């Protein structure tokens, strides 16, 4: 468990003065899983710090206050990423408690790393158990062992029913993955536009799934960051892939959609309002945007 | 900042200390922050800081927005609606504001209990310019709290910067030709960073070849024909960029090399928050040598 290897650490390092820091390492697509747990204890945490750091700048520059006074999630897959584990085995050095996140136990991971929770991974996976679900919740469970948490319930309402709406939503997008294929199918520049905690899937699906799986050109638009330059090359051919999150950023998402719509033209929008997701409550909605968005996105990719 | 982080630490001793620190802005100015951030992240056990853009901080703020957290905006001309209600809201929890800016009149300033400028325009100083000044609220916060080990090594990069800059601009003059020439035809351009130089790279994206040009661009970070404006970083991140220039070379590449327009005279302990000061300000010789050699003056928007 998650909760149980906070409890073990929160007591470890209670003489040391305890855990005050928390950094999320990992690269690219795990770089960017930890994101909503990086957004989450930014906008929760009164007393954390939290830092979502690229294995390889984490390596060749680790944080002074990389302590005992800190912890250290590292996610991998395979968890063979000289990267990933030259940063586990600098944080033991520095004698910071580390979890291990890998779906392949035997890995020179899970025997360079203070704890391992292993994640679902697979087709048809329960997604509560995702590599991102188990980055929020080593950051919700920290918050809620050490300053407490006001909405844990709702957290773990909002978790148990993140594969009723994903898996449920995954289908409802032939919908639309069809069309969408045969549209952009030969453009050579996709952008992907995303703001909240939710940012992290679409920034993943420019480097991971774009630019890297279909040899294609993209990047990734803060869609509050769209009014300070970006929003000049908005054409009528410009083709952009727009997630349209749930909760206190869907404000700043909708002023951007407005814009592309009364302005752009082919607009590929996946709105998480239209997938089911209100279901979840308002006070955490936002750290679901990014399981939502990381699990349907394939289906447009595979198309 | 020294004064303006002195009066802050004096003002707020009293309801708790400075805890959090908060950077908030839109597009280039938020861009001039990214090394400031990275100081924190690297070097404080302390503090804490926050890097948003305003559009999300007005929406989604921290909880921590309180008497215990330092909030500094930025605005060039010092009026984006966005960037004033988030210095609304920040004063509104008790938080002492810091006004960067360059129109000390700006409807900004009615919101801003301290505020500072640096300098611009052409031919200016390295060691006065708004990123200097972002990054130095960093250096005394962390100082006037909790100590910088390296803060006598970090006024000495700000001692040599100008000077390396000024050498470096007219360093890459004739290149910039070239690369005008190359890069005219193309229509889409990455960016590529790592450390507290990747807020150049980005604005490099955002600013000037998305904005000012309408080329596409993304910025790459490392660890994450096509063209490649390559940012080969100093300081601790330079392995980093170094073997994704590997990738690049042994696989249409503009590399712009930090140790090779004179970087290193800095120490190794500063040098890293020193890439974006030079990166930002070699740039511009690459961007009107292009603008030219493209039809497209950097004055055009179509839009804001």
Same mark, same amino acid.
């Given at each position: ?27 690219? +697509? ?5 994101? #909503? ?16 750091? !690229?294995?390889?700048?984490?390596? !060749? ?17 395979? +968890? ?72 844990? $319930? ?8 993140? !594969? ?22 030969? $453009? ?41 330059? #970006? ?54 909605? $936002? ?13 447009? !990719?595979?198309?």
């Amino acid at each position: 468990g998650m909760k149980e290897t906070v409890s073990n650490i929160v007591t470890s390092q209670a003489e040391k003065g305890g855990v005050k820091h928390v950094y999320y390492v990992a690269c690219g +697509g795990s770089y960017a899983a930890f994101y #909503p747990a990086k957004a989450f204890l930014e906008k929760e945490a009164k007393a954390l710090t939290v830092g979502l750091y !690229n294995s390889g700048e984490f390596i !060749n520059n680790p944080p002074v206050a990389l302590g005992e006074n800190a912890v250290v999630v590292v996610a991998s897959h395979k +968890g063979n990423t000289p990267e990933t584990i030259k940063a586990a085995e600098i944080a033991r050095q520095h004698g910071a408690p580390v979890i291990g996140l890998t779906w392949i136990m035997d890995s020179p991971l899970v025997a360079h790393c203070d704890y391992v929770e292993t994640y679902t991974f697979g087709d048809g996976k329960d997604i509560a158990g995702e590599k991102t679900m188990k980055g929020l919740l080593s950051a919700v469970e920290l918050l809620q062992q050490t300053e407490g948490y006001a909405h844990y $319930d709702d957290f773990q309402d909002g978790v148990s029913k993140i !594969n009723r709406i994903v898996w449920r939503a995954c289908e409802q997008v032939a919908e639309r993955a069809q069309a969408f294929a045969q549209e952009y199918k030969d $453009d050579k520049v996709i952008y992907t536009v995303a703001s909240g905690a939710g940012y992290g899937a679409a920034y993943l699906q420019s480097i991971c799934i774009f630019m890297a799986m279909q040899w294609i050109h993209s990047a990734c638009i803060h869609s509050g960051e769209f009014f300070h330059g #970006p929003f000049e090359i908005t054409d009528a051919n410009t083709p952009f892939f727009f997630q349209f999150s749930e909760g206190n950023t869907r404000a700043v998402d909708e002023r951007a959609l407005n814009f592309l719509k009364k302005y752009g033209r082919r607009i590929e929008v996946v709105d998480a309002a239209a997938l089911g997701l209100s279901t979840i409550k308002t006070t955490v909605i $936002d750290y679901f945007n990014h399981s939502l968005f990381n699990n349907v996105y394939p289906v447009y !990719n595979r198309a």
